[PDB]
Every structure is written in structure tokens, then in C-alpha cells.
Amino acid sequence: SPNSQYLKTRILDIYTPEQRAGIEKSEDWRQFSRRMDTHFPKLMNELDSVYGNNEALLPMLEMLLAQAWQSYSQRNSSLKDIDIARENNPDWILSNKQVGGVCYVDLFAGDLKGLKDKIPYFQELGLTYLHLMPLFKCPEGKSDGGYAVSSYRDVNPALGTIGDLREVIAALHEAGISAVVDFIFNHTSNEHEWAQRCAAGDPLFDNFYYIFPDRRMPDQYDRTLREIFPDQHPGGFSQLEDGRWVWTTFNSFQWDLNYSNPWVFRAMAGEMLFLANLGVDILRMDAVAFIWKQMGTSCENLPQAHALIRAFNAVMRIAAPAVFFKSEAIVHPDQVVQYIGQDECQIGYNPLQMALLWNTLATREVNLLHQALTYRHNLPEHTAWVNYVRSHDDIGWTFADEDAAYLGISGYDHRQFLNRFFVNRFDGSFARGVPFQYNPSTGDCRVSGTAAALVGLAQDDPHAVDRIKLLYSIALSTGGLPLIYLGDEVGTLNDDDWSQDSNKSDDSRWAHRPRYNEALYAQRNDPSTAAGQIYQDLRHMIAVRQSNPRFDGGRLVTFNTNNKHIIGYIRNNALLAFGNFSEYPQTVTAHTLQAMPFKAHDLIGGKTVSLNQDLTLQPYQVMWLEIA
Numbered sequence: 001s002p003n004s005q006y007l008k009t010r011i012l013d014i015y016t017p018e019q020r021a022g023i024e025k026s027e028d029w030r031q032f033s034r035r036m037d038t039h040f041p042k043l044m045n046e047l048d049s050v051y052g053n054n055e056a057l058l059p060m061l062e063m064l065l066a067q068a069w070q071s072y073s074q075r076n077s078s079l080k081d082i083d084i085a086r087e088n089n090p091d092w093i094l095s096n097k098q099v100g101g102v103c104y105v106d107l108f109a110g111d112l113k114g115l116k117d118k119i120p121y122f123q124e125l126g127l128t129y130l131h132l133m134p135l136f137k138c139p140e141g142k143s144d145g146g147y148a149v150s151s152y153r154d155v156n157p158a159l160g161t162i163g164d165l166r167e168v169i170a171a172l173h174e175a176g177i178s179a180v181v182d183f184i185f186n187h188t189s190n191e192h193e194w195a196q197r198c199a200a201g202d203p204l205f206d207n208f209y210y211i212f213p214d215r216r217m218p219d220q221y222d223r224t225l226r227e228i229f230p231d232q233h234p235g236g237f238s239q240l241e242d243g244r245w246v247w248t249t250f251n252s253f254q255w256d257l258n259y260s261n262p263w264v265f266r267a268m269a270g271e272m273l274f275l276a277n278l279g280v281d282i283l284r285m286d287a288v289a290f291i292w293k294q295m296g297t298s299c300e301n302l303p304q305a306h307a308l309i310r311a312f313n314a315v316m317r318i319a320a321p322a323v324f325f326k327s328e329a330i331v332h333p334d335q336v337v338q339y340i341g342q343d344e345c346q347i348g349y350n351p352l353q354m355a356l357l358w359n360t361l362a363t364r365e366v367n368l369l370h371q372a373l374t375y376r377h378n379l380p381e382h383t384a385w386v387n388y389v390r391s392h393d394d395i396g397w398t399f400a401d402e403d404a405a406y407l408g409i410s411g412y413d414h415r416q417f418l419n420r421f422f423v424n425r426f427d428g429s430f431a432r433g434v435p436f437q438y439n440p441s442t443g444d445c446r447v448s449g450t451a452a453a454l455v456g457l458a459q460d461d462p463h464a465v466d467r468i469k470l471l472y473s474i475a476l477s478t479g480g481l482p483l484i485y486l487g488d489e490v491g492t493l494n495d496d497d498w499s500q501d502s503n504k505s506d507d508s509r510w511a512h513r514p515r516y517n518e519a520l521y522a523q524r525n526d527p528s529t530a531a532g533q534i535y536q537d538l539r540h541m542i543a544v545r546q547s548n549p550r551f552d553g554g555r556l557v558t559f560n561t562n563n564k565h566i567i568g569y570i571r572n573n574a575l576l577a578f579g580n581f582s583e584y585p586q587t588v589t590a591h592t593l594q595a596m597p598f599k600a601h602d603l604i605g606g607k608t609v610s611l612n613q614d615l616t617l618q619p620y621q622v623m624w625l626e627i628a
């Protein structure tokens with residue numbers, strides 16, 4: 001394979017003799033050259049592992065690297081400073097100081113300019129990380145909430161212009177907040193120019209997607225394909241006007257990109273560089289599990305999918321060091337963690353913890369949660385979990401059947417219980433969620449609904465507020481970067497019109513995608529309201545997390561509480577956390593605490609607690625005891 005020095009010389013051949021001389025002496029080239037030598041080996045290796053001796057590999061690479069240089073040269077000086085800072089501080093993502101939030105620009109603040117006006121509030125809340133949902137042009141009507149991209153560069157006019165976005169990013173950086181956007185690279189909308197030209201037979205866009213003449217291949221593939229939206233279509237394919245079939249893992253209007261074609265990688269790498277130069281700090285790698293297909297397999301988590309992502313990682317290491325990745329892999333735990341690594345995705349959603357928080361609220365038993373915190377929490381160096389309570393999506397019960405089997409729990413039977421409980425089809429359930437994608441052929445089902453809707457706030461369950469606080473307390477202190485679903489900090493309930501909207505009625509996820517609730521936000525300072533109680537609660541926990549070094553890092557050690565309703569863990573051997581998932585008082589005996597100091601200050605309630613005697617926690621109470 002060619003080497004870094006070889007490719008760099010060729011990159012400089014576009015400059016006349018006089019220019020070439022100057023370029024080689026410039027700071028930009030110096031840094032670019034150094035990073036090329038350091039990271040090119042990985043890029044080449046990962047790409048080769050996927051394409052092999054593909055004739056297009058070499059040509060695609062030189063073209064991509066030429067862009068990488070141009071992209072780095074044009075990169076703004078301020079961004080280059082962030083590039084240097086993060087190069088030498090790979091663990092910035094692990095700082096206890098980081099706290100993120102996520103919202104739809106349109107639902108939360110109208111448009112881009114409006115979002116800019118909400119920045120003061122984000123600072124007031126303590127955010128240092130902000131994820132904005134899909135901002136670029138997409139089909140009018142149904143676009144899977146913007147996840148069906150028709151243009152990676154043209155901002156949805158309803159939100160503003162590319163200029164407004166560029167402005168928002170700079171304002172976020174000014175307020176000490178990182179910009180986080182989606183990198184929907186597994187597929188585009190069926191209205192995207194690429195799709196159009198590919199299907200129309202433009203030789204330039206040949207093999208940019210997976211299109212079949214009939215059901216021969218589709219049927220073979222469907223034998224092992226999981227259905228994500230069985231409500232929309234069976235298997236993973238959709239039929240075109242002309243009768244052909246296109247691979248559509250998600251909605252029919254979302255066509256999977258064909259990474260078996262190296263020119264497809266180059267295309268998306270180009271888009272990443274575009275997003276990088278806008279000043280994006282973290283790219284949410286959407287559906288990383290499906291970017292590689294292979295007949296007979298599930299076409300999820302394949303080796304080449306990981307390799308491609310590590311290739312993308314390399315491009316950023318060379319042309320935009322500040323850009324980190326956030327893996328969205330809502331799959332089996334064993335698979336989830338494989339996307340997380342310094343050379344792949346530095347951080348990734350922690351669906352296991354999230355799903356188990358809700359599970360524990362239902363069963364009142366921390367068994368599965370404790371198991372996960374004990375065996376699946378700690379990660380490799382320079383990587384972190386993104387811990388969350390809810391997201392724009394439904395809740396999938398992605399705990400491991402094998403893990404559950406160890407505890408004498410039948411995964412299938414357990415999920416059936418969980419699903420019933422959270423959609424209020426179980427006696428006594430406090431949850432008011434809505435079903436999502438009930439698959440009659442598999443028994444699988446997911447749950448939609450806001451955090452407040454699932455804890456019982458819609459009916460004013462007296463335990464609703466403390467439940468919210470408890471869940472967020474755990475995502476905030478286990479170790480990793482905590483993500484707040486904006487709207488949750490004031491107990492925002494479900495949207496009560498989505499079912500009436502013909503563009504949303506067939507997607508219950510819109511039930512937990514409500515608009516900014518002016519009334520609730522106007523009560524965040526009133527301790528007598530649910531909004532105020534939830535707000536000050538979370539704000540206080542955020543404040544503590546960010547100021548107390550004992551929460552730093554992502555490592556944790558579980559503590560056996562000897563009480564099936566109480567979870568316990570220790571951060572940095574100095575912070576002991578207890579969490580009662582019972583609606584009744586529960587005790588951690590003096591005998592269980594013998595190894596703990598006689599007294600410890602609780603950062604949650606502010607009181608001094610004695611650990612030389614039984615410790616009784618009130619319903620849903622959380623304690624952050626300083627033991628060192």
C-alpha cells in the first residue's frame with residue numbers, strides 16, 4: 001500500500017513551484033503532515049481491511065486526502081486551537097464538568113435564531129454540551145423527524161440558513177458549550193440528489209445504494225434481517241415505482257447507503273469534513289450498526305462496519321482532531337461496547353443503563369442494574385459512556401438475555417411484563433407510556449412517552465418527582481457524560497396531538513417530542529410546583545457533579561447494599577451513592593456499613609448521615625455520601 005510521505009508529495013503537486021515552497025513551510029502543513037504520519041497508517045489499514053485490492057481504493061484515497069488538506073487549510077484558527085487542545089487531552093469527555101442536553105430546534109426554540117436566544121438558559125442550567133436534532137433539508141411531511149436527509153449542506157429553511165447555524169455554533173462556543181449534531185451516514189432520504197441519480201441510472205452514482213431487480217436477493221436477506229419499523233414495512237427492503245427493490249432498514253423513504261462502494265465512503269467523509277469545519281465538536285454516528293451488509297448475517301455489527309468507523313475516526317485525527325464521535329448503537333450489550341474506543345467512537349450511548357433504570361422502577365429490584373454496573377460499566381481508557389434517562393426515541397429493553405438468565409430471569413417473559421407496565425396494561429402501574437412497533441411476529445415492542453409521563457406525573461403521582469430525580473441522579477453520577485432530554489428538567493408531559501397529526505399518527509415517538517412548555521418553564525423557580533421541584537433538584541445535582549472532583553472519570557465500583565431495592569456504588573473511592581427504587585422506606589443495615597466512616601456528608605440533602613447504625617432511606621431517596 002502507498003505511504004504517508006508518498007501521498008503528501010502528490011497532495012502538493014497542485015501548487016506551482018513557487019507556491020509549493022511556501023506551503024511546505026507553513027504551520028498548517030506542518031501540523032497536517034505530522035498528523036498524516038501518525039494517523040494515516042490506521043486509515044490505510046482500516047480501509048484496506050474493507051476494500052482489499054479494489055482498483056478504486058488508491059484513487060479514492062488520494063482524492064479524499066487532497067480534500068482533507070484543503071479542508072484543514074480552510075479550517076478556522078479557533079477550531080484549530082480546539083484541535084490542539086483535545087489532541088493533548090483525550091479525556092476531556094470524561095470530566096465530571098461535562099453535562100449535556102438535547103433538543104429539537106423547532107420544538108424547543110422555534111428556529112436557529114430562537115435557539116441562540118435560549119443559550120443563556122443552557123448556561124443557567126449548567127450545560128457544556130448541546131445536541132441539536134437533524135437540522136438539514138428533508139422531505140416535507142414525513143422525514144422520520146429529519147433523519148431522512150435530502151441535503152447534508154442545505155439547512156431546513158424552516159430553521160434558518162447555514163449562516164444561522166454557523167452563528168449558533170460560535171455562540172455556543174462563546175458560552176462554553178460544545179455543539180453536537182447528527183451524522184446520518186447509513187442512509188439518505190429518497191429525495192436526496194444521490195438517490196435520484198442512482199436510481200435513474202446516472203453512471204456517476206452507480207452502486208451508491210443497494211437496488212435489486214426483484215425479491216430474489218431481498219427474500220434471502222430478510223431471512224436474517226431484524227425489523228426496526230415493522231409498522232412501516234416487512235424485512236429491510238422497499239419497492240420502487242418501476243418495480244425494483246431498494247434496501248431500507250428504516251422508513252421506505254430512507255435508502256441505505258452502499259459502503260461496499262469506496263466512493264460512498266469518500267462522499268460521506270467529505271460531508272464529515274464539511275460538518276467539522278462548521279465547528280461541530282461531536283458527531284452523533286447514527287445507526288452505526290447497519291453500515292455493512294452480508295447475505296446470511298444479520299447485517300448488524302459486522303467487522304467492516306467497525307473498520308469503516310475507525311477509518312472515519314482517522315480522517316478526523318488528520319483533518320479535524322477536535323471532532324469526536326458519539327456512537328448510536330441500540331443493540332445487544334456485548335455489541336454496544338464494541339463501537340467504543342479511542343480509535344473508533346470515543347463515547348457512545350449507554351442503552352443498557354438507561355433501559356435498566358426504567359426496569360428497576362417497575363420491578364423495584366436493582367438486580368439487573370447492579371449486574372450491569374458491576375460487569376458492563378467500566379470502559380477502555382480515553383472513552384466514555386453517554387448516560388441518559390430518555391431520548392427522542394422509544395425505550396427498547398436491550399438488556400442481555402444471557403445476563404438475565406444468570407439471575408433466573410426469562411428475557412422474553414420479562415420484556416412482556418415491562419412493556420405492559422409502561423403502557424399502563426399492568427395493575428397498579430404508575431406509567432402512562434404508549435406502545436411503539438409491536439411486532440406480532442416476534443413479540444417485541446418498545447415504549448414511547450416522556451420521563452414525566454412514565455413516572456406518573458400526568459396523574460400527579462406523589463412519587464413522580466422523586467422518581468425523576470432518582471433516575472437522573474444515577475445518569476449524573478455513575479461516570480460518563482450525562483445527557484438531559486431538555487424539557488425533562490421541568491417535568492414536560494406527552495404531546496397530546498401527535499395522534500391527530502396525519503404526518504405523525506403512525507409514529508408514537510412524537511408523543512414524547514413535545515414543544516417548549518412556556519407554563520412549566522415559568523414555574524422552574526417556584527418550589528411549590530412540580531416544575532420547580534424537578535428543576536432545582538436536577539440543577540443542584542448538576543452543580544454538585546460539576547464542582548466535586550469525586551465524580552470525575554467514568555470508573556465505578558458497585559457496593560453490595562444487601563437490600564434488593566437499593567442500588568449502591570462508589571466513585572473514586574470517595575463518593576458512596578445509594579438509590580432506593582422502592583416506593584417504601586428501605587434500610588441498609590449497620591452491619592453492611594461497618595467498613596464506612598461513622599459519619600458522612602450527603603451532598604443530596606445536605607445533612608450529615610451516621611453510618612454506624614441502620615441507614616433508612618425514604619421512598620425513592622438518593623444519597624451521595626462523601627466517604628473520602
Ligand SMILES: OC[C@H]1O[C@H](O[C@H]2[C@H](O)[C@@H](O)[C@@H](O[C@H]3[C@H](O)[C@@H](O)[C@@H](O[C@H]4[C@H](O)[C@@H](O)[C@@H](O)O[C@@H]4CO)O[C@@H]3CO)O[C@@H]2CO)[C@H](O)[C@@H](O)[C@@H]1O
Pocket residue numbers: 362363364365409410413414417428583
Ligand atoms: O411495590 C410494587 C409491587 O412490588 C412487588 O411486585 C413486583 C415484583 O417483586 C418484581 O419482581 C416484578 O415482578 C415481575 C417480574 O420482574 C417479571 O419478570 C414478570 O414475571 C413473570 C416471569 O417473567 C415469567 O417467567 C413467569 O414466571 O411469570 C412471572 C409472572 O410474575 O412479571 C412480574 C410481575 O407480575 O414486578 C412486580 C411489580 O412491581 C410486589 O409483589 C407487589 O405486591 C407490589 O405491588
Ligand SMILES: OC[C@H]1O[C@@](CO)(O[C@H]2O[C@H](CO)[C@@H](O)[C@H](O)[C@H]2O)[C@@H](O)[C@@H]1O
Pocket residue numbers: 231434435436437438439499505506507508509
Ligand atoms: O398506540 C397509539 C398509536 O401508536 C401507533 C404509532 O406508533 O402504533 C403503535 O401502537 C400500536 C398498538 O399498540 C402497535 O401495534 C404499533 O406497532 C405501535 O407502533 C399508532 O398506529 C397507534 O394508533
